[PDB]
Symmetry: C2
Subunit: 361 residues, 2 copies
């Protein structure tokens, strides 16, 4: 029995109801039913509808299921970019997405900020010939966010561009204005508290139409995971290929649970936990903020500079059945990353902070 | 509690140990651990090694994990075909794979047999400029197989071509001669008895080298799921993106179970069940063979023509806690499809046949 609580930024601690929901999945033989069955269609619709409700999506948006967020990066470029994209790059994830454009033979503009820093939109312009704008709400590697108010400044910079937001390590925390962007995506092993194995692509009419326009130009936009392919199946509560039904099932159940709290309720809970952690960092003799600009510090993946090795910190936390993440990549010995996801309770965070205060200081 | 036994050809009845293995997964927090952790590397290696052992793969082959078999169709063409492929097409799955080539801008040769029929290699030639040969060991839509002895005839028809075999609905039944082909693939929701959400691509040095050659020619071969990308990670017991750890875990456990029986043992078990079913079809007043040539009838997905509607058959079977598949597509009212996978026991098949004999005849 693994009793350790993981404050790691994805995969992470499973949403607390997942165990019982998985037992239900096994009992109901969710893993056995046909992906073409009425029962599967019901499972699909529950997850799709619950996301639309939780995220308050308008009628011009659709929800599509894929294998991973990384897959979604690829599909965005294949379906929606003929020649050029524009990317805000400030860390490892936003950088990799930018790199995909070139690997796929496209030309990408890059607006870059140093690792540990964010963006100041007043200073940013977007070339007119950029077809899409790729923003990262939460750069998980560095702990920097692009708040919704900043995201909202991009629409007028290039009115015709399709705006995509990576909220992989933050949704459902940000509350988007769906009229100012065109698409958001995530995968389920971060704030949704599921095992990895499912990506979710939320996209609007403008995105769909762009894919259809490229296909009409006799450009290949893919195969099974073209937007039209996925859309045709989504309209009958299905997927083109046999999907990860277990996760679609679990997602509908967890989102149901989330709806009982409400998205705003979860947001408040997220903020209360972040405040506990940040208050401790304000006076810690070991930890300091990994991101200088307080407005741009992530509420969901809190990155702290540390004078102590993360390995040493985790060794101290082990007897207390807790673990935090180490810094990303080359920061693995100089920062920690504390996941603050819905799966993490106030009491768990309280225990973490108290333990850190007492044993690390 | 869903107590019905599903003889459906994928998804299908879970391997009998899956329930307890899933409980272990939950207990060990397999869904929580990092995909970059030593523990994950161990899980990965167990699944990879067990497949190499079970399938008796030689040293020039590697095992790669993807999201689905359908994804693998796409990746084969992207990574390995510059201009032209060759496909044997005799049903819905083999047809769709063939269609992907054109959707991706390639030109595909098609060797076609009617639905319900198979191939006679003596009569088949492969153009020299075909870069790959795509064979389907088990055409799940029609219940027709291409036995290994027939598969083996292709190597000399085009020595330089890469030979790919779709064994999605049959592995581990066929026993391939790995020197006469270059790659095989499957997904886990058929004979491996897992919930859907994992594809497996087994490929050799020749396949790997072709991908590297195309990339060198300055052709895009993809992004996260290029062969080199996947290979680099496979060599450290990882994947490029966050994968379906639950299924990688379950796959290693089930393959462990399978190894205790042995692949040849499972083959004998498969044959014994098929014989029970086929003996009944020989004298049934309702069922007849969906495939005329006995040599080409599938041992894993048995297709029978039926004078009774599958819906009526299943209504009769319902009180007995069993179900069979209906015919594929336009055959949904005139054929049934009986899955005979490792998950189905001799006693279960015996119960099915006895019930059919007694109630249908």
């Amino acid at each position: 029995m693994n009793n350790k609580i993981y404050f790691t930024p994805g995969p992470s601690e499973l949403y607390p109801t997942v165990r019982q929901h998985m037992i239900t999945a096994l009992d109901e033989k969710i893993g056995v039913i046909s992906h073409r069955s009425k029962k599967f269609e019901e499972v699909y619709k529950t997850a799709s509808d619950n996301l639309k409700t939780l995220l308050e999506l308008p009628s011009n948006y659709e929800v599509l299921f894929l294998a991973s967020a990384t897959e979604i990066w690829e599909r965005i470029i294949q379906n929606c970019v003929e020649k050029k994209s524009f990317h805000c790059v400030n860390g490892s994830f936003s950088k990799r997405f930018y790199e995909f454009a070139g690997e796929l033979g496209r030309e990408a503009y890059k607006e870059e900020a140093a690792f540990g820093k964010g963006f100041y939109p007043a200073d940013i312009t977007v070339p007119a010939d950029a077809e899409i704008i790729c923003l990262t709400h939460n750069e998980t590697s560095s702990g920097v966010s692009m708040p919704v108010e900043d995201i909202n400044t991009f629409r007028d910079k290039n009115k015709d561009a399709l705006i995509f937001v990576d909220a992989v390590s933050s949704l459902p925390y940000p509350k988007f204005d769906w009229t100012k962007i065109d698409s958001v995506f995530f995968s389920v092993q971060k704030c949704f508290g599921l095992p990895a194995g499912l990506g979710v692509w939320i996209l609007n009419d403008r995105v769909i139409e762009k894919s259809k326009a490229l296909l009409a130009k006799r450009k290949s936009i893919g195969t099974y995971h073209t937007i039209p392919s996925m859309l045709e199946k989504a309209r009958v509560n299905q997927t083109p290929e046999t999907p990860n039904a277990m996760n679609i099932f679990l997602l509908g159940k967890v989102t149901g649970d989330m709806l009982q709290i409400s998205a705003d309720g979860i947001r408040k809970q997220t903020e209360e936990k972040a405040a506990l952690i940040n208050t401790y960092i304000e006076s810690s003799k070991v930890f300091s903020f990994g991101v200088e600009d307080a407005k741009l510090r992530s509420m969901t993946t809190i990155v702290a500079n540390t004078t102590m090795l993360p390995g040493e910190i985790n060794k101290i936390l082990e007897p207390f059945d807790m673990a935090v993440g180490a810094g990303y990549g080359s920061k693995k010995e100089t920062q920690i990353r504390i996941a603050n996801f819905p799966a993490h309770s106030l009491e768990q965070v309280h225990k973490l902070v108290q333990t850190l205060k007492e044993k690390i200081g």
